[PDB]
Amino acid sequence: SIKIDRFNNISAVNGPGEEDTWASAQKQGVGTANNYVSKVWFTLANGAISEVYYPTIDTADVKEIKFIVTDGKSFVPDETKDAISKVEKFTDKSLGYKLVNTDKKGRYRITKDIFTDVKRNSLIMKAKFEALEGSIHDYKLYLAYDPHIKNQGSYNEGYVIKANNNEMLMAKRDNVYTALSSNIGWKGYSIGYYKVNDIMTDLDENKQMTKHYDSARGNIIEGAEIDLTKNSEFEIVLSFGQSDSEAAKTALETLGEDYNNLKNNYIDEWTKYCNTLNNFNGKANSLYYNSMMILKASEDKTNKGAYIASLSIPWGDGQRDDNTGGYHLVWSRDLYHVANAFIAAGDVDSANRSLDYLAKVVKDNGMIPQNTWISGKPYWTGIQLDEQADPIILSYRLKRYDLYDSLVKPLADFIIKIGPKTGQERWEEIGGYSPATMAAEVAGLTCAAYIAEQNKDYESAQKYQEKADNWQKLIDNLTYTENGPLGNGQYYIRIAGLSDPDADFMINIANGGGVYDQKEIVDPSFLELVRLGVKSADDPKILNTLKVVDSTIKVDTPKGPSWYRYNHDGYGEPSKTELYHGAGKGRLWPLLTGERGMYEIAAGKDATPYVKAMEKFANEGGIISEQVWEDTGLPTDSASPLNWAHAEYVILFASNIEHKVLDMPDIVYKRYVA
Numbered sequence: 001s002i003k004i005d006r007f008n009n010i011s012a013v014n015g016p017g018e019e020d021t022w023a024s025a026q027k028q029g030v031g032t033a034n035n036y037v038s039k040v041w042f043t044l045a046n047g048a049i050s051e052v053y054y055p056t057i058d059t060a061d062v063k064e065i066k067f068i069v070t071d072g073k074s075f076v077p078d079e080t081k082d083a084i085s086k087v088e089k090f091t092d093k094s095l096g097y098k099l100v101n102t103d104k105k106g107r108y109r110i111t112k113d114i115f116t117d118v119k120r121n122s123l124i125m126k127a128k129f130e131a132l133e134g135s136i137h138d139y140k141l142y143l144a145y146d147p148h149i150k151n152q153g154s155y156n157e158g159y160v161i162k163a164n165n166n167e168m169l170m171a172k173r174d175n176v177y178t179a180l181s182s183n184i185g186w187k188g189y190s191i192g193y194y195k196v197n198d199i200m201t202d203l204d205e206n207k208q209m210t211k212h213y214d215s216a217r218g219n220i221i222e223g224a225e226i227d228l229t230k231n232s233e234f235e236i237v238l239s240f241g242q243s244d245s246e247a248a249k250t251a252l253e254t255l256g257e258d259y260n261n262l263k264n265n266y267i268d269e270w271t272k273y274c275n276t277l278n279n280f281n282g283k284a285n286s287l288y289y290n291s292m293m294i295l296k297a298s299e300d301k302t303n304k305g306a307y308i309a310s311l312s313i314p315w316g317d318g319q320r321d322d323n324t325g326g327y328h329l330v331w332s333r334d335l336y337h338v339a340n341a342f343i344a345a346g347d348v349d350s351a352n353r354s355l356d357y358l359a360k361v362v363k364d365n366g367m368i369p370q371n372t373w374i375s376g377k378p379y380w381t382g383i384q385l386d387e388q389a390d391p392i393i394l395s396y397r398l399k400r401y402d403l404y405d406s407l408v409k410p411l412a413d414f415i416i417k418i419g420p421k422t423g424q425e426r427w428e429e430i431g432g433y434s435p436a437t438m439a440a441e442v443a444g445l446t447c448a449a450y451i452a453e454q455n456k457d458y459e460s461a462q463k464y465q466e467k468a469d470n471w472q473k474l475i476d477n478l479t480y481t482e483n484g485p486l487g488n489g490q491y492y493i494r495i496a497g498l499s500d501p502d503a504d505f506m507i508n509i510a511n512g513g514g515v516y517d518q519k520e521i522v523d524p525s526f527l528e529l530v531r532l533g534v535k536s537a538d539d540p541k542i543l544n545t546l547k548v549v550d551s552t553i554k555v556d557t558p559k560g561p562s563w564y565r566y567n568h569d570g571y572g573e574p575s576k577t578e579l580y581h582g583a584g585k586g587r588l589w590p591l592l593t594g595e596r597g598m599y600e601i602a603a604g605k606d607a608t609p610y611v612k613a614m615e616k617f618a619n620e621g622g623i624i625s626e627q628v629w630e631d632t633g634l635p636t637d638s639a640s641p642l643n644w645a646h647a648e649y650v651i652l653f654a655s656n657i658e659h660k661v662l663d664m665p666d667i668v669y670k671r672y673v674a
Helices: 199-206 244-256 259-274 286-296 332-345 348-365 385-397 401-418 435-454 458-479 524-531 540-552 590-602 608-617 643-658 666-672
Strands: 004-006 029-032 041-045 048-053 060-070 083-089 097-103 108-116 122-131 140-147 156-163 166-173 176-182 188-193 215-218 220-226 233-241 506-509 514-517 554-557 560-563
Touching: 004 244, 029 108, 041 108, 048 122, 060 108, 060 122, 060 176, 060 199, 060 233, 108 259, 122 244, 122 259, 140 166, 140 199, 156 188, 156 220, 156 244, 166 188, 166 220, 166 244, 176 220, 176 244, 188 199, 188 215, 199 220, 215 220, 233 244, 259 286, 286 332, 286 643, 332 348, 332 385, 332 643, 348 385, 348 401, 385 401, 385 435, 401 435, 401 458, 435 458, 435 524, 435 666, 524 540, 524 590, 540 554, 560 590, 560 608, 590 608, 590 643, 608 643
Parallel strands: none
Antiparallel strands: 004 156, 029 041, 041 048, 048 060, 060 140, 083 097, 097 108, 108 122, 122 233, 140 220, 156 166, 156 215, 166 176, 176 233, 188 220, 506 514, 554 560
16 A cells, blocks of 8 residues: 655654644634535645644644745744735635745745645645746755644654655644655654754754754644755645544645646535525625635535634743634524525525534534534533524524424523523623523524424424513613613613613722723624614614714724724733733724624614625634724734624625615514514
């Protein structure tokens, strides 16, 4: 079959190396083959491949793969920080990327083509080096691969082998192996310890490879020099496997394939998917398709229906390298919104798979936990009522009345047992009576009653609706203050702790936000009331709240308007030069710009400016972050892409064209807002 020869000629010294961190969460791009066979996902940041996942979407194995160039005499620039990167996709209907990194000093230029092998688990990167000033022979090019197998940078075992006369740098941890190869091979290799004797450190001192270790374990960096005199353009392949032979064999198969063929196959698969989506009479734009592919690419390929929140590690630069994947979890709320985008786009199958995933969760838990791993196992144990309701609402829109016994009834019964109060509202920080959460509960029980009737369970149907009607009539008395310190004192507050929104009640804001009276805090989430058809867009209580919200937490950035989640939000960078580590300052959410746009449509007004604002908030790669700065409207180091925000953009974009709220459950609207 294959002839692999391993050798341990020289082991690295003075390990295990210093501790590491993940890459910046601001991504230039994300991708994966549009099939379930190729279980590899990649992300791009700062002009280079950042985290790479295998064999599941919540299993990061790589921190970075970047190029380092030097003249072998003095300067040593790291492309990820000493060069300007420009990103563009192969086409508007494929998650394939081209990167052009131009040295800030204009000495060199590196161009990359990145995508995966549709048939096997391998990441491909074609690259070419160009000498802008002087001659190419005056430069040295080195590749630095940083493996963080199974979500951790420490204790990574690195070594070198030879598969069919092909020198591959190997890395392993438990059952996960990686193989790094070159179509033209390496001019030299070395596996050293991070910040000790790694390729980067070796160059800072010698500006050329001095060490050539072929073994190491800990926080390692697998470096290699590219023989430029042999070819300024080459192909780098990274394969994965559950063994040395598998990884190596996979790399050999990918390398043996014709480049253009692999690339075209990758693009065609993605294009095929895009062309299956509604184009809205030719109005569908690039951001629409980009958003839909990103969502499509956010599903685990083993646990189908498991869509994650974001394929990034927020403020990763400041996060320690051990076990990280906060946004790599499944939230019923985010999944619900993502499913709505798939529905709006015409990909009903994807929405149903996500619903069936949730049905599986309810079967094993009897309810929806705060969030779960992609496997379906519960993670956090917070109690969010809105999360118990959304799957019911989705069951209704997908007309999946077959899930009544396994999904609808258990969740509806659970909600009636503990509602209308919630353990925590959608920001997952505080409990009480929330207009957004109660809106979800009313909509969910109404949809549950509808489905119960379809199943001829009239007893439950009546029970559910009666509860829904009762809670709907109490929303105002429980969350609408008329004694607030803001504006005219009349508005829905973020959340009430007691059964009287006019009473005094101190709450503790998360992330070091401080202590304030419930009446001092407003949250744009109240618009969920109208979004779900629980309240009319022209209800004077809604308008009154809007005045207070825009006077306190609205900001017109040079990219357009956006809003904070609520006053005194601390979930974000404390300053422009500091990363979020638990206590800082919450920034603007393009997600909320989209939600306001959706409300405007409900109010019978043009939402184009909100569509345009979201478009400008997206970066060069068409990726929308969770948060953006108030002064420039540019992305912070928050999670990106924020799948929920892309889903919101898709729904807003489409809704603004149809002139109606495409994801609002009609029976709820007809009963309360019509």
